Amino acid sequence: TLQKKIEEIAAKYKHSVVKKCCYDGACVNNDETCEQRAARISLGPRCIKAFTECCVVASQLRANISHKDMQLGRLHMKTLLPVSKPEIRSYFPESWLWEVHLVPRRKQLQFALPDSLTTWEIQGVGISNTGICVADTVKAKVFKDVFLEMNIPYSVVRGEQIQLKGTVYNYRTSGMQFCVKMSAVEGICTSSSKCVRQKVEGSSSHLVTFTVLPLEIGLHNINFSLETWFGKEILVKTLRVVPEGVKRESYSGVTLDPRGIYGTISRRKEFPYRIPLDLVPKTEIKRILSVKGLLVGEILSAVLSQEGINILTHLPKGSAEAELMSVVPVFYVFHYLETGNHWNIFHSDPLIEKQKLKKKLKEGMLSIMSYRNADYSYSVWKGGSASTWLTAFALRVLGQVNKYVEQNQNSICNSLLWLVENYQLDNGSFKENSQYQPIKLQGTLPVEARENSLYLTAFTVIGIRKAFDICPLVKIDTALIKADNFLLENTLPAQSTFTLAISAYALSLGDKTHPQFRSIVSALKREALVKGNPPIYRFWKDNLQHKDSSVPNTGTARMVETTAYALLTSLNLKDINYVNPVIKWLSEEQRYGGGFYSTQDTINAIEGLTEYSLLVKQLRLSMDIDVSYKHKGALHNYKMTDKNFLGRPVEVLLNDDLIVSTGFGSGLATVHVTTVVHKTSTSEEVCSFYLKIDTQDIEAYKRIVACASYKPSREESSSGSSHAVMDISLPTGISANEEDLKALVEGVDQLFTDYQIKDGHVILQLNSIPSSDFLCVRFRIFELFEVGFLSPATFTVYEYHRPDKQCTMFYS
Amino acid sequence: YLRDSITTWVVLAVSFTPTKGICVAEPYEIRVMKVFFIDLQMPYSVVKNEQVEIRAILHNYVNEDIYVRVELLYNPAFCSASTKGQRYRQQFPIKALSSRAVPFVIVPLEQGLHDVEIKASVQEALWSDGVRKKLKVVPE
Numbered sequence A: 001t002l003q004k005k006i007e008e009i010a011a012k013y014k015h016s017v018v019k020k021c022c023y024d025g026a027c028v029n030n031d032e033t034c035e036q037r038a039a040r041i042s043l044g045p046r047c048i049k050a051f052t053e054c055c056v057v058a059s060q061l062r063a064n065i066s067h068k069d070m071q072l073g074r075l076h077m078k079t080l081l082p083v084s085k086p087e088i089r090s091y092f093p094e095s096w097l098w099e100v101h102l103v104p105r106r107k108q109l110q111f112a113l114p115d116s117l118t119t120w121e122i123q124g125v126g127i128s129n130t131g132i133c134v135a136d137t138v139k140a141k142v143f144k145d146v147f148l149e150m151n152i153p154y155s156v157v158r159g160e161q162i163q164l165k166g167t168v169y170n171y172r173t174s175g176m177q178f179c180v181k182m183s184a185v186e187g188i189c190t191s192s193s194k195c196v197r198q199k200v201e202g203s204s205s206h207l208v209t210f211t212v213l214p215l216e217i218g219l220h221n222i223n224f225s226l227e228t229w230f231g232k233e234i235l236v237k238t239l240r241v242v243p244e245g246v247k248r249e250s251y252s253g254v255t256l257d258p259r260g261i262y263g264t265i266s267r268r269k270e271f272p273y274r275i276p277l278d279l280v281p282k283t284e285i286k287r288i289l290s291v292k293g294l295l296v297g298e299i300l301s302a303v304l305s306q307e308g309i310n311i312l313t314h315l316p317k318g319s320a321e322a323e324l325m326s327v328v329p330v331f332y333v334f335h336y337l338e339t340g341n342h343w344n345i346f347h348s349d350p351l352i353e354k355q356k357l358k359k360k361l362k363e364g365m366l367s368i369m370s371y372r373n374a375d376y377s378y379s380v381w382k383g384g385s386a387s388t389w390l391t392a393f394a395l396r397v398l399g400q401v402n403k404y405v406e407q408n409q410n411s412i413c414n415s416l417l418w419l420v421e422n423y424q425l426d427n428g429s430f431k432e433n434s435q436y437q438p439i440k441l442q443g444t445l446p447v448e449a450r451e452n453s454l455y456l457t458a459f460t461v462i463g464i465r466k467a468f469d470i471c472p473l474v475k476i477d478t479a480l481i482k483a484d485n486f487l488l489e490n491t492l493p494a495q496s497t498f499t500l501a502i503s504a505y506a507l508s509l510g511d512k513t514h515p516q517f518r519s520i521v522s523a524l525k526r527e528a529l530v531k532g533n534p535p536i537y538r539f540w541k542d543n544l545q546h547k548d549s550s551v552p553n554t555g556t557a558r559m560v561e562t563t564a565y566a567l568l569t570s571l572n573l574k575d576i577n578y579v580n581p582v583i584k585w586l587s588e589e590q591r592y593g594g595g596f597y598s599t600q601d602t603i604n605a606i607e608g609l610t611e612y613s614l615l616v617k618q619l620r621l622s623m624d625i626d627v628s629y630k631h632k633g634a635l636h637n638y639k640m641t642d643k644n645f646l647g648r649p650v651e652v653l654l655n656d657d658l659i660v661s662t663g664f665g666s667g668l669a670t671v672h673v674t675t676v677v678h679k680t681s682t683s684e685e686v687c688s689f690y691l692k693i694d695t696q697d698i699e700a701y702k703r704i705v706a707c708a709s710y711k712p713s714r715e716e717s718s719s720g721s722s723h724a725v726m727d728i729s730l731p732t733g734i735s736a737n738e739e740d741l742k743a744l745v746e747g748v749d750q751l752f753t754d755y756q757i758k759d760g761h762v763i764l765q766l767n768s769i770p771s772s773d774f775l776c777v778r779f780r781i782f783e784l785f786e787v788g789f790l791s792p793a794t795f796t797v798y799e800y801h802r803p804d805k806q807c808t809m810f811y812s
Numbered sequence B: 001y002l003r004d005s006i007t008t009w010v011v012l013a014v015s016f017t018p019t020k021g022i023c024v025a026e027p028y029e030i031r032v033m034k035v036f037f038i039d040l041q042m043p044y045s046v047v048k049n050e051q052v053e054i055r056a057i058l059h060n061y062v063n064e065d066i067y068v069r070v071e072l073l074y075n076p077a078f079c080s081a082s083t084k085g086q087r088y089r090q091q092f093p094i095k096a097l098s099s100r101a102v103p104f105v106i107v108p109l110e111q112g113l114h115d116v117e118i119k120a121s122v123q124e125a126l127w128s129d130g131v132r133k134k135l136k137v138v139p140e
Ligand SMILES: COc1cc(C(=O)O)c(NC(=O)N[C@@H](C)c2ccccc2OC)cc1OCCCC(C)C
Pocket: A005, A006, A009, A010, A023, A024, A026, A027, A028, A054, A057, A058, A062, A063, A066, A067, A070, A071, A073, A074, A077
């Protein structure tokens, strides 16, 4: 064993600083050569040579060395790792019966034991006037001798012959007899129920195989009743049945305004029932109508409803940015009810409901305590390199919570002194540490490199100016003047209206009286877009007007973010007249729930809906708002007043049209409708990504190969896309080998950056997809249970900050 | 191997070591029990040619409502309600966690010790118990 080289090549890196670079060099990557995968390493050339000179010595030592030999060297290479990470291989449930009780010498209380097979321990501590008495513990060992449990899959497509695998277990030493039967329902077409006697061996198991073929779509009910020698036990299972194809969600928003305060009148709207072209049959088009009181009324119903929803539930987790979007909508509600002094809404004690909001502002402050490095710097992924983009976004968010939750003083102080002292050039311009790309800017590379540096410093000044009132030292203001000078001396002329607006907003937190400053704001007003005469709507665009002369609808995430930056620089200059068509456009492009398109145009566009919502006073919003179908009767209505304006978003079942009726009244409320169709094909959409996905049989096991390549937009650099998310939906009964996805994100030669298998999806985030060659993901799968009539699944990539730059492919 | 009684057996070990004397161990209890069974409480002795009623309780320790067919099996030395070609079956439901007294009218004919066998099985289920017990018939 340990032939000759394994003992010498590991002892050389036994006490090295780059021993971990050698460790993940010797990992098996079959489809990438040694230099091909070494190119994506970015930790300096010292880590590359420790990688490559441990990579070449294992591909040679895998030709004529044994299988038994190399898997002993996999254990000898274990000491090149950092020490064993704290992990537990068990999941203990949330402990029930956690309460205190006043017992007058005898008390009885009843409860249901939870559906788990574990031996509980109930202990009692009695605090009274005599002292403390720890009672003798009792056990609650719920323990069945023969029991089944079924492996009900989470999501079954309609029209598949699902084999429901389950296993009976027999803890008893004597083998015994049993029979399992299944409660047939009207939906389930299964191939009075006969009992056929099978037999488990002693201290063993026995497989149980049924077969269903569901027809109806919804949450069904199947009861598995094992009747062994020790009685009959019914195990109640819920089988969710799901349609086939992609799920498209389209939106629509209307602002109700019976009095026409800030524009033209608006007293009526219809909702056209447009059935699309490539629809699946037999599945209803579902709609949900939501009617909310204030401008922030859609935002309040996110935070005050205990359903536990986020603004961007469609976008995946795993970033540090996704952990800052769990403290933002709690904050912009708390910035409203405290500065505007609106603590007279709640029927509960408002000092108590203030504590539960300050609860979540304190929980969310802990969520990026883990993404902070040792030098108080913030890294995007877990354990990744530090970023000047995230720290400026971590100081923007935390520098705002300080007025309502007391921060740690020194935490911001070493963090602001990391940006100014390490990553700011002589001419104010900042730079980036890692290869993280938050956004993709247009133009060719020498024109873009100036434009990328302008966005990167203008996103930094917002991080400084929101945190300047916490740690106001003399160096971070010494840096701010050349930071403000660089945002003067280079942003005109701007090659993109997106970078022009964030340059104008970042300067709109300091000296607002420069001859160059209002030169920007006049030039920012020059490239605005207007609807109607007088303008009922205003918005902006990513393109300059001279290179692109089009004014479209169904705007993108660059349209809603650039609109909100021009808004907040004109709410800091306090221009009411110019921004009244902007608020009407922004609060109608908002989806249902509070969420906008992406993350970066929700943090910037709820502040615009809160810095303008602190201009509207108590408007007596009390209407008898009624909605109906045209060729049908009304569902219902209710007295919608200031007492209850957070009402429940109603469901629309009948397939007629919709008309929302405000007659007379007073107020300014909003109407939002989400439609949820299921589709068959997607070729009529715009694929901005070359996609191909194959299923191939490797020989070392069925493997799945999926590649992706960014189609560049016109007048862009051909370097590659920004932060993108690969979302392979797995087919039914197929499970992904997670150890093959761990090997793509854990090395120093990582392809992706984070993975998560969530509800049968395979979601992979990534810094960049190139445009020259494809970027392929290779993980093995295995048929977990047999499924006939296998409906094809989908494969979507999309940029994380522009989720409409996408492409979709069906596969099976 | 356990015997066929649904009771609680009590085992009793008593040792003898030549230098440690006698040690009587504590009673250890084995608890034989099934869920659907037949209890056949029988008299010690019944008179020949005199008609007696023998009840047979059926316990159902199952949370389901069950459906059971109970058959008094034929015996040649009896004059029971079961004929030679046809047994005396009777079907009825039992509630969950309850009993049902099933009375069997039997007049013995020959003296000695004869079997009274009763078989019962649940409809469309697994549980099924049969009991054969001997009956002491004496003359006078
Ligand atoms: C962390 O370093 C290793 C990872 C792995 C890993 O499983 O990824 C590994 N496994 C491995 O060789 N398997 C054998 C059975 C194999 C043999 C031939 C062809 C393919 C093979 O693999 C599928 C060995 C490793 O180091 C050993 C010494 C290298 C050092 C001393 C330079």
